[PDB]
Amino acid sequence: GSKNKKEKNKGGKGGADCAEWLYGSCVANNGDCGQGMREGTCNEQTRKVKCRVPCNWKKEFGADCKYKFGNWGECDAATSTKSRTGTLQKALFNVECQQTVSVTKPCTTKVKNKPKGKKGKGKGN
Q: Is 100 left (phi over 0), alpha (psi -120 to 50) or beta?
């Protein structure tokens, strides 16, 4: 029977930052958009970082001048394009616009719907 004694167990450590903080949501300081602050979350902690909050979330399109179009004129199959004239309704942008302006559209048509035919081009043979 040989007895003895020798035990060991060194070690123990933990903590440090979250390592590579991941963020995405940006907060605007000015209110609508601009240079502000940002709060990011990693695992189960929060962080602060400076970012830019540019305006470009919602959108649709842009206008210029509005007119009152009635009924497209007659299309000329010879040019496969129609012409018309619209009267200026009101100024919403106050930009440069004439009281009246013409328009164009890719329309084509020929041989009007007029009355023709007489008992089958009359008799014959």
A: beta
What are the residue boundaries of the structural domains of the chain, listed by start? 1-57, 58-125
**Which structural technique was applied?**
NMR
CA distance 41 to 58: 26
User: CA 58, CA 8: separation in Å to the nearest integer?
Assistant: 64
Widest CA span in the chain: 139
Tell me which architecture the domain covering 1-57 has in CATH. Single Sheet (2.20)
Task: Give the dihedral of Cα atoms 108, 111, 115, 118; nearest 10 deg.
Answer: -150
Amino acid at 114: K
Secondary-structure breakdown of the chain: helix, strand, coil percentages, each rounded to the nearest 5: 0, 30, 70
Contact 67, 42 (CB under 8 A): no
